[PDB]
């Protein structure tokens, strides 16, 4: 009952943190719709599909870099739509899949007014999300930190 990134950071049960690296469109102008799709960057797996119910929730999310400043939008989780960075957590979501399934999260951050040129830097921390692993059996509710990094630098032609 653990989760892994697209780079290869598998976080075992017990809590931990990974560094996810997401590539965003390097061209995003004021009024665009940029989406940090993490469903292609993060994947969770329930190694105990019979022993543990597959359940996950984003505890909280935080924004940084140009994401919090040059960008603005919202954050999405399993088809949710809440402000980013959030103030609490996400809806209750069950994984109906006993295999490595992508983590349905996306940070919709779009260039405000104060966006222009290099807005996102590759290798730089852009956000921090934390996922709650909780189950009905063991109740080993550990949480995994998902440091969202830019896989690619983004420029705002505006």
From TrEMBL:
One of its GO terms (biological process) is cell adhesion. It comes from the Bacteria. Residues 3-147 form the FimH mannose-binding domain. One of its GO terms (cellular component) is pilus. Disulfide bonds join 3-44. This is FimH. It comes from Escherichia coli. The chain holds residues 10 to 167 of 227 of the full protein.
């Amino acid at each position: 009952f653990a989760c892994k990134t697209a780079n290869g950071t598998a976080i075992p049960i017990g809590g931990g943190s990974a560094n996810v690296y997401v590539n965003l469109a390097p061209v995003v102008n004021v009024g665009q719709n940029l989406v940090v799709d993490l469903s292609t960057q993060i994947f969770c797996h329930n190694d105990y599909p019979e022993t543990i119910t597959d359940y996950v929730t984003l505890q909280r999310g935080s924004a940084y870099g140009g994401v919090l400043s040059n960008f603005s939008g919202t954050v999405k989780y399993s088809g949710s739509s809440y402000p980013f960075p959030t103030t609490s957590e996400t809806p209750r979501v069950v994984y109906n899949s006993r295999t490595d399934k992508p983590w349905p999260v996306a940070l919709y951050l779009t260039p405000v007014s104060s966006a222009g040129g290099v807005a996102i830097k590759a290798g730089s921390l852009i956000a921090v999300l934390i996922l709650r692993q909780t189950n009905n059996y063991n109740s080993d509710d550990f949480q995994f930190v998902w440091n969202i990094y830019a896989n690619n630098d983004v420029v705002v032609p505006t």
